């Protein structure tokens, strides 16, 4: 991503044509190509991928392949209006419940932005499938109204008995809960950890770890206490909890998740990353594959930053207010500090090049 | 929109067939009742709300692990068997409760109480947002505060304001009103207060005016009444049973502390003693400043002029002054309120309140 090229696509493309997953492997290649060619214009991929699906090449009768070709098209062509119609025919061609959810998402991506009632409404009727609950997250950032409801709304869904609803909501939470505490879900999860089965315990603790990522001490506490209270009592338990402690403290505990930023703009990349890890990361859950896929979760993960710079605009001493610990030198961890000082261009959050008034002219 | 209807109608239909099949097995009509106790031999003794008790068998919709004592339940009529579970939100569980989930009142709306504002903030708001300062040092937090003064102006305002800031359920119970005249029923009523709290946290528990059930006497013979003391003790034992870092902060109202037990203070719980005073010049300036925003008025009126003739009054007097003043302006048929109007109004309420007098200059 950011250095996309046709040459690898040409080499990879007929091997994708060979298609069975345990051998030539390139059925999954589709995920990788999609994420590379995110958010831009490139008809070659769209067409090649589109024919191969519609034709029903090689060993096309595997479910995983129908999934890969559907998703690949949608992921790559984000924000391409009319062009997008081609993709809509393939995805539409094999109906699913994932697909009724995805009609609104492709429309968001293509027509540019979100802000209308319809798209929240159309999902809301299905909710009250995995992809559908995931989808409120992606939609709500443009909805002025939408964000406050999201946190209550998926809180309810976790508790729902049925096993599928139980796997899918924790991943969504693992992203969410590093900036949005919700009491209800964390308190529930403790009982569900010993509910009736080994697999549910695997997922629970792993889930607590995602949610804990980059966030430590304070308001987290009710979730934090549950994690400490497990370490081992079995060899399966030892293994899972240890993996949880790395997640909990990923990037030395001071990393964050944002799917929207303070510089008023969204990221296409970040929607695609989450989408692609969802197809993967299933090793200790339903939809089993292999362990390596965990790592795709990384692309989403951001260091926290407010970066002051003085009048040089490149690293130079400059001070802005205290953290939790003192007033800061440049590049020194902390986030969201507004200041007195006047920018060159626009006082807001983010990397800022700053200038100080001549009445107390300073490097600060 | 169009998309929902196409899907909705075939989707609705399968559900209804299943739903009909469910409905037939479980029956109707039913009495609602309350579980007396839950028994693990798959039985239940239940309290029927018509009165009598029946030792009944559960009909499987839920287990006895998906049931709790005092849950509301659907009862048949066979012997009153448990058909299904029902929520307790609707069916009574209250003493005297005003529930105001996130109240209208806020610090901004009651002017400058700023010094009082600061105390209540470090005790009640700060743990809920930040367990972390208490945790790091390793000290317990105040989980109670006491508000002293008169309500509507001191005790009531600060407590409404803070709840709105923390986005917690404000529960006002009137202490005296429980002061029921029959032996034994205060203690039930205290139980229901604590029961609701633990179910429905975060919450601010406001107990108004505990000085009728708050008594603790020296006797129970010779005009001594035994209920009053019992109720005071049940209240105390639950309070000391509950401890939190940010699930419950308790606000009390009362104007005597030597009618209360030293274990209802419980030193190491109630650290904070917040009391109303009459405000400073600066804070008075702020109370005036907000209230005149809302007026249309002359420009001969100043905040400064109004301050100097004030001797330190409550914020309530300042509010009262504004309503009285506008009424002389509306009587003169006009919407301009002079410096003279607010001055006539202030003098008049001050005069009605200060019924006792004492020469202090000598």
């Amino acid at each position: 991503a950011g250095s996309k090229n046709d040459e690898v696509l040409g080499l990879l493309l007929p091997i994708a044509a060979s298609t069975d997953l345990p051998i030539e492997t390139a059925a999954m290649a589709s995920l990788a190509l999609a994420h590379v060619f995110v958010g831009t214009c490139n008809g070659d991929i769209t067409t090649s991928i589109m024919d191969n699906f519609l034709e029903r090449t090689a060993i096309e009768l595997k479910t995983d392949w129908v999934r890969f070709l559907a998703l690949a098209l949608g992921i790559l062509y984000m924000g391409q209006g009319e062009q997008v119609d081609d993709v809509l025919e393939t995805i539409s061609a094999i109906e699913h419940p994932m697909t009724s959810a995805i009609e609104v998402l492709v429309g968001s991506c293509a027509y540019t932005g979100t802000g209308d009632v319809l798209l929240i409404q159309d999902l809301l009727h299905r909710l009250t499938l995995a992809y559908a609950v995931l989808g409120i997250a992606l939609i709500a950032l443009g909805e002025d109204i939408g964000k406050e409801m999201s946190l209550r709304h998926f809180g309810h869904l976790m508790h729902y008995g049925n096993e599928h609803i139980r796997r899918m909501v924790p991943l969504a939470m693992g992203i969410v809960s590093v900036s949005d505490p919700q009491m209800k879900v964390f308190d529930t999860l403790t009982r569900f950890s010993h509910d009736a089965d080994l697999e549910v315990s695997m997922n629970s603790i792993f889930a607590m770890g995602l949610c804990g990522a980059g966030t430590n001490n304070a308001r987290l506490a009710q979730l934090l206490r549950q994690l400490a209270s497990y370490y081992s009592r079995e060899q399966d338990a030892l293994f899972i909890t240890r993996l949880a402690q790395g997640l909990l403290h990923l990037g030395k505990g001071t990393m964050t998740m944002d799917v929207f930023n303070d510089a008023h703009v969204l990221n296409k990349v970040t929607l695609a990353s989450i989408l692609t890890t969802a197809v993967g990361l299933v090793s200790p859950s339903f939809m089993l594959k292999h362990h390596q896929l965990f790592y795709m979760l990384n692309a989403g993960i951001r260091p926290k930053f407010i970066l002051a710079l003085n009048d040089e605009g490149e690293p130079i001493k400059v001070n802005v207010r205290v953290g939790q610990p003192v007033l800061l030198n440049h590049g020194e961890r902390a986030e969201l500090e507004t200041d007195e000082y006047i920018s060159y261009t626009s006082h807001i959050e983010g990397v800022v090049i700053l200038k100080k008034n001549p009445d107390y002219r300073e490097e600060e | 929109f169009v998309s929902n209807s196409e899907i909705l109608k075939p989707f609705e239909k399968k559900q209804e067939e299943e739903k009909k099949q469910l409905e037939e097995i479980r029956g109707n009509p039913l009495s609602i009742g309350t579980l007396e106790e839950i028994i693990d031999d798959d039985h239940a003794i239940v309290t029927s709300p018509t009165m009598p008790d029946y030792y009944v068998s559960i009909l499987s919709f839920v287990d006895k692990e998906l049931l709790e004592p005092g849950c509301s339940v659907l009862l048949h009529h066979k012997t009153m068997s448990i058909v299904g579970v029902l929520q307790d939100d609707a069916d009574p569980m209250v003493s005297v409760m005003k529930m105001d989930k996130s109240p209208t009142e806020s610090y901004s709306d009651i002017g400058g109480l700023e010094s009082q504002i600061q105390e209540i903030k470090e005790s009640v708001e700060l743990p809920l947002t930040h367990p972390e300062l208490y945790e790091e040092m390793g000290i317990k937090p105040p989980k109670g505060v006491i508000l002293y003064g008169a309500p509507g102006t001191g005790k009531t305002l600060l407590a409404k304001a803070v709840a709105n800031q923390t986005s917690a359920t404000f529960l006002r119970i009137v202490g005296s009103e429980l002061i029921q005249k029959y032996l034994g029923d205060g203690p039930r009523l205290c139980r229901q207060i604590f029961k609701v709290a633990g179910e429905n946290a975060p919450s601010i528990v406001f107990i108004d005016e505990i000085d009728a059930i708050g008594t603790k006497r020296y006797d129970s013979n010779s005009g001594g009444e035994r209920e009053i003391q019992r109720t005071m003790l049940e209240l105390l034992n639950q309070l000391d049973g509950f401890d939190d870092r940010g699930d419950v902060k308790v606000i009390m109202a009362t104007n005597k502390i030597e009618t209360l037990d030293p274990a209802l203070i419980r030193p190491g719980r109630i650290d904070r003693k917040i009391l109303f005073e009459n405000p400073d010049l600066s804070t008075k300036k702020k109370i005036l400043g907000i209230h005149t925003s809302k007026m249309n008025l002359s420009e001969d009126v100043n905040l400064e002029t109004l301050v100097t003739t004030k001797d330190d009054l409550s914020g309530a007097d300042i509010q009262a002054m504004c309503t009285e003043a506008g009424l002389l302006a509306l009587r003169e048929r006009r919407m301009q309120v002079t410096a003279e109007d607010f001055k006539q109004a202030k003098e008049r309420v001050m005069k009605n309140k200060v019924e006792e007098n004492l020469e202090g200059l000598y």
Partner: peptide, 29 residues
């Protein structure tokens, strides 16, 4: 998986129990 398991259990048990209690209620309980 889980949702279907719970409901079947609850219908199955309930019909047997409903027959047994009614039998013990005969007499006038």
């Amino acid at each position: 998986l889980k949702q279907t398991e719970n409901d079947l259990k609850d219908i199955e048990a309930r019909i047997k129990e409903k027959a047994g209690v009614k039998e013990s209620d005969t007499g006038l309980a």
